[PDB]
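Margin note from the TA: students keep mixing up input and output lines. Inputs are the sequences; the output is the structure of the whole complex. Example:
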Amino acid sequence: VGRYYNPFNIDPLTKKHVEDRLEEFINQVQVGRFRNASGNAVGTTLAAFLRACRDKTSANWRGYSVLVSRYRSLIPNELFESLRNISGEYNINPQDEHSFFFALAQINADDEFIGAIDKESAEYLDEYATLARDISNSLTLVKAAFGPLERTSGSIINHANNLNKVINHVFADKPLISETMLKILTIDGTTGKDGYRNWLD
Amino acid sequence: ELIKVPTIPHNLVLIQSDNGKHALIKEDLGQWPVETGISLVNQAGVFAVQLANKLGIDKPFVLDAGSNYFTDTSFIDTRKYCTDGLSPREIQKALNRQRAYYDRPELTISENKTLLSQSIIYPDADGNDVSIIFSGAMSHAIFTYAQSQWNKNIIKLDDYIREITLTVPKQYRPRRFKEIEHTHGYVYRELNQGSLLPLVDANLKESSSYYFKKLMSSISNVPVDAQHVSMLTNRLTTANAPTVRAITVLTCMFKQFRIGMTYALDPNIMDVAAATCMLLFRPAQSISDEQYRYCLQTMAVFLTNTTYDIVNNDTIDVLKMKLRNQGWPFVERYNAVEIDMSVEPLRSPGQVGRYYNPFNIDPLTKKHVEDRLEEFINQVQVGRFRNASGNAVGTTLAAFLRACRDKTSANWRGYSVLVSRYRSLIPNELFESLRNISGEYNINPQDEHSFFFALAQINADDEFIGAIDKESAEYLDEYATLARDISNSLTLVKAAFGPLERTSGSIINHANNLNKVINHVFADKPLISETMLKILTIDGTTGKDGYRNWLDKLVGHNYPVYVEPVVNIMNFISARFVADSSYFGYTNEIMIMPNHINVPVDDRFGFRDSPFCTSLPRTIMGNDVRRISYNVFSMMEDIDDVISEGFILYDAYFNFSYDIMTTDGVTRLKEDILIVTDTGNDIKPIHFYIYFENRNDKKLRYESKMNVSYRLYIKTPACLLPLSDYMRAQHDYVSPSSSRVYIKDPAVVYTRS
Amino acid sequence: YRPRRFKEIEHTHGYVYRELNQGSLLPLVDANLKESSSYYFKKLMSSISNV
Amino acid sequence: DVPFVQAYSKFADDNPRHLRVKTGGKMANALTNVIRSYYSINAPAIVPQV
Amino acid sequence: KLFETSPFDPLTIKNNQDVVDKLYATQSSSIQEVVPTKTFATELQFGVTS
């Protein structure tokens, strides 16, 4: 279970923008004189584009609300909990944002659903269970085959990389072990030497 | 048009055995498949329209069966024998064959005459003719009900005229109907006006832009009659005269049609002239409070030689006081005088229409509503403006004001006639609802002054009046189509969609259902006329998209929708579809019993091993019959033990057909009763081969006991009727009088021409 | 829901090899996902067919 | 159990585990103690403003 | 597949610097918070040399 913000600040119960005075505001801008006491046409131009943004928003909010749900259904619970720790900020050029709302494409997503079931999303979530089985299988087999690891010489990055090559050689009849361990290290190794230490832990 | 139905759809057949002992009357309304797991009422509605098509009652009709009769050769008969329905001759032959089997005497002459005179046509007091014939119960009930619903809209010609008297103008010549049409004239009119508000309220911008453009495409075609002073002479222009003329009519035609003027950054004596003309010769209703300030600020800037910065924070009262002290008396906006229309407006029953008189001229006084106009002009002439000793500004402004006043006082009647004619085109709801949301009709300051300074007489020739008469018919057609489209869309929303919650499941369900409705609605012939599509595609969105957003808005509406006659006809048929299922070939429960168990069955029709029962037994051998739902029965793996005792299958809709065979034989099903698979059980399609019974055939008796091991029982269909009860098939149909003339064009006036 | 029945021979004498270990995604999950999140988000957006 | 799990998540700001008894979390704790504070002056009134 | 293109091949790196350079090369494949452009410097000093 989870929660996501409805796109474009539209309340599904009222099927309108959260601000109930939006139409009144647009009319106020149209008659308003701006940048000068005499009209510069700023009010007419801004009101015309703001009305178009609202009309496109109200017409095309259902598709984006469904789209966000479909994307959320592709994520397992364990992976979602990890992503709650990270944080970030996205920078958008002003031209891209205005062009996004002005030219707002419609997402149909009708043929994807068979009744109330999305086959592609349901099948994509299921393959993570196979991945979970492989991760535990590979981890236990490497622990039993290699035991405690000691580094007499060399660096941590060199220690882990050469160990992965030996795993491929020892378990050559089972290529899944090398692939699964490389998947974990690829995620772990982005941090650098600290991530390699986390992989060995 | 109003179609006329010659014959009555009795929908009856007579089936008799070869030996003649048994006969029955069957009503054949067809076979309609029913799918389980979904709502039955929704399927009934689809079949209701097809059933109405079969009976010929979908479209408005009047029955004429009065001439379907013949007269006997006897002298004292003087009776009309109806041809429609099942002929009594067939019943006579069936009854005579029955008597031959029993060695009874044939029907005597007295009973033959009584039987052959059962179907008659006789007139009633009102002049209608009543036909008594043999017909089915459901065919009679459906046909007579549709007759009642259509008859509500058939009214006398004099009654129709009395309803439309108030809407008839004075310019048009009255129409002389023939004396027959006054006494025996009848028309078919709906006489219900649907509201246009649901479309207008939801889309105020798109609807207003559509109607303003349509009106302005016609007003602009009206036939017309052909130093500071140097500055205002140079700005004079005429290329935009048709546009400003139509804006003038629109302001006086609608209740609140607001226009705006954008002055130059540096105000000129042009700007003050335009501000004075608009504040004087335009309705106060068309002037917003913001535009009142902006016009006042422009006056103060030029006259007081002050820049916009100081006057930007001044209120209305402060600006008026500042202007008045300098010597400017024109600081007020004037309300127009409303002129009542001579006739009631279209689509406005029992309502009074009004329009503003152009140029702020009082009809009773025939001069400007301001009684101090001459005194005010004198002050401007002698006043000192721009903080200068010279009076060039004051005198030149008074000269233009006098010219504008003289021009308006002479051309006001011509514009009043134009506004009066175009006001009659729009209904009352559009007059109060349409707004200028988008400022697409702004007026330049040079255009405003040049329009009033160079005002031209409006010439109303025959061609222009004739052109408007064509537009009036087009406007009336458009309003009728939109009302029908609004009514259809309001009914679709209530039946199809529902409320929306804050759950992803509800949003997905709403989106998918909405797309299915839109795809089905726009397939083949679209449900919505092209007039509504033009309104919804004004912004630029496609027809499918524009309709889709409007349907979303209408969800949860409380708009009242009038119940048209064809709604009631389909509703009546749908109720009978659910209530009387056996008439249409489906039932709600079946019984499977072994042969050795004796069940009470219907024995009226003389069937050998009849599969019909009056009602499915509540108890057999002192114990209640087990009832199993179809879903439970499908998943049963111990079915072999269950069918040994016998059960009743329910919670499903079973489609069945039967073929009554005249000869004698073993009554059996076409296929096996059930099919057993690994992935559930199922009941194979039911088809009965029913045979009439000879009790002394030992061969066929032994086969029934031994060859068939299990038997299927259903409730006896109500369409079947034994021949001995043929008087239960007598039904009455009433056809209106033949001395009625139906008027296709009930218009009461002619064009002046 | 119920499973479909096999052949009669397989019910009387049939045997099947099964593993009951379901596993866990935590070893892949438990990491500093800050840098790998951007690459994973791009793959996520491409999974659903784009208009 | 989806509608109840979804409603309990809004009330208690947590998804329950199978073994742990469901009682309402912080909202239940705050509501129960505030009820005591209303009844009498002698009640501790130990609920923070945050 | 967890990634359309992997952030870097772990078997090719040898130190922390190699990871940084590889991450910059593959940053076009990922959704970037800020798409890189020409850098802007507000501080620059040149020291004396040998």
